[PDB]
Paper text:
These enzymes can produce resistance to penicillins, narrow- and expanded-spectrum cephalosporins, and monobactams. ADC-68 differs from ADC-1, which is not a carbapenemase, by seven amino acid substitutions and is still the only class C enzyme reported to confer resistance to carbapenems by itself. In this study, we selected a triple mutant of the intrinsic class C Acinetobacter-derived cephalosporinase ADC-1 (ADC-1TM) that confers high-level resistance to the carbapenems meropenem, ertapenem, and doripenem.
The crystal structure of the ADC-1–ertapenem acyl–enzyme complex shows a clear dimorphism between the two monomers in the asymmetric unit. In monomer A, the core of ertapenem is clearly defined, and the pyrroline ring is in the Δ2 tautomeric conformation with the exocyclic sulfur coplanar with the ring. The O7 carbonyl oxygen of ertapenem is directed away from the oxyanion hole (formed by the main chain amide nitrogen atoms of Ser64 and Ser318) where it is hydrogen bonded to Lys67. In contrast, in the ADC-1–ertapenem monomer B, the pyrroline ring is in the Δ1R tautomeric form, and the C7 carbonyl is bound in a canonical conformation in the oxyanion hole, hydrogen bonded to Ser64 and Ser318. A potential deacylating water molecule is observed in the active site ~3.9 Å from the C7 atom of ertapenem, the point of nucleophilic attack leading to deacylation. However, this water is hydrogen bonded to two atoms of ertapenem (N4 and O31), which could negatively impact its activation and also hinder a closer approach to the C7 atom. If both monomers A and B are also present in solution, only monomer B may contribute to the very slow deacylation of ertapenem detected kinetically.
Residue numbers in the entry: 3 to 213, 216 to 361
Write the structure that this text describes.
């Protein structure tokens, strides 16, 4: 293998491989893209009971990293004139017209600032009918637009509206329009039966395989392979190489919309001035930032040099993605067991700080 192949292999063995034994993770896939060259590393088992090893065809649940595709879909619809970010959801979901949630605009939904949407729906909201009822019954609390609270319902409503604006269901927005535009071959909202042998099992804290809520797809419902996620990073590092409609979509997800301490909220992606200190990257996943409302501040001028990342999990999968435009580099980690977000962020910080230019 090439000297770079061996260097990156050593850095990933040094920084990511020990995490498998440390947290009893059955399988992991780690990818690096640098200067348009992709490097794939696979460890362990996609399914413990089948002794099937993780490989380039293994499909992982991306969990909350799915929001990056919802963001891209929204950027796509906005730049085709199908929505404006100043629109409100009742323009598209007519049953929300003349309700209080129709006072929140689409950008505020996409970036979690409605002022009264928590991490998850209430436990009793279990069906699509009940989701619509929930949004009709919704009342504001904190001043609309002023407080960020990370929220699956919030970006789920944004995704539902994006789909309505494109006259197709959300799963078709991704599987027929967005994934093909990005060149992805094995990314899914619904994994077909022909791929089930490649669909990894996820493992809980007792290392047992389990296998969603309503309106979940835009918030946490995408599945993908390591080669597809490296392709997605390639698109984010080189949007100018893609046709205009998806190029504009991608660029839209890189624009910071407001600031919370050292973090800038873009669409889906979290944005930081580059270089970001390790503490800044860790702070973005603190309990205060992730679970509580935080007052936003308007951006004076966007940082001159930027980097981006996103964590995400399900109860049984973990994901991390990060990229640095100036260095033409990015990294993806997929696991079929959760590990602490700080471990994912620290390991990727070590690798990207050590790789030779
Ligand atoms: C991300 O979008 C995804 C969450 N991310 C993470 C993570 O650690 O990266 C977790 S971890 C853990 C698993 N389930 C918990 C959860 O969802 N908490 C929660 C908070 C408030 C209400 C409820 C509820 O009523 O169900 C649950 C956190 C998690 C997978 C989720 C938000 O989709």
């Amino acid at each position: 293998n090439t000297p770079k192949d061996q260097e990156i292999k050593k850095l990933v063995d040094q920084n990511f491989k020990p995490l498998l034994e440390k947290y009893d993770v059955p399988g992991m896939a780690v990818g690096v893209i640098q200067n348009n060259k992709k490097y794939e590393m696979y460890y362990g088992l996609q399914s413990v009971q089948d002794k099937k090893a993780v490989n380039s065809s293994t499909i992982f649940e991306l969990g909350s990293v799915s929001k990056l595709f919802t963001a891209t879909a929204g950027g796509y619809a906005k730049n085709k004139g199908k929505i404006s970010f100043d629109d409100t959801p009742g323009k598209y979901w007519k049953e929300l017209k003349n309700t209080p949630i129709d006072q929140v605009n689409l950008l505020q939904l996409a970036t979690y600032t409605s002022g009264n949407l928590a991490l998850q729906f209430p436990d009793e909201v279990k069906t699509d009918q009940q989701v619509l009822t929930f949004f009709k019954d919704w009342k504001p609390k904190n001043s609309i637009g002023e407080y960020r609270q990370y929220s699956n319902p919030s970006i789920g409503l944004f995704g539902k509206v994006v789909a309505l604006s494109m006259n197709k269901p959300f799963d078709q927005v991704l599987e027929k329009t967005i994934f093909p535009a990005l060149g992805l071959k094995h990314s899914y909202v619904n994994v077909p039966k022909t791929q089930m042998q490649n669909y990894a099992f996820g493992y809980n804290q007792e290392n047992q395989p389990i296998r969603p809520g309503p309106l979940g797809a835009p918030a946490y419902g995408v599945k993908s392979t390591l080669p597809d996620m490296l392709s997605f990073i390639h698109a984010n590092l080189n949007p100018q190489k893609y046709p205009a409609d998806i190029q504009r979509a991608i660029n839209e997800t890189h624009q910071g919309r407001y600031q919370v301490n050292t973090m800038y909220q873009a669409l889906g992606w979290e944005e930081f001035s580059y270089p970001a200190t390790l503490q800044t990257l860790l702070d973005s996943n603190s309990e205060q930032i992730v679970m509580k409302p935080n007052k936003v501040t308007a951006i004076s001028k966007e940082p001159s040099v930027k980097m981006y990342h996103k964590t995400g999990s399900t109860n049984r999968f973990g994901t991390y993605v990060v990229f640095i435009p100036k260095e033409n580099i990015g990294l993806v980690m997929l696991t079929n067991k959760r590990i602490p977000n700080e471990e994912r962020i620290k390991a990727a910080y070590a690798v990207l700080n050590a790789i030779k230019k």
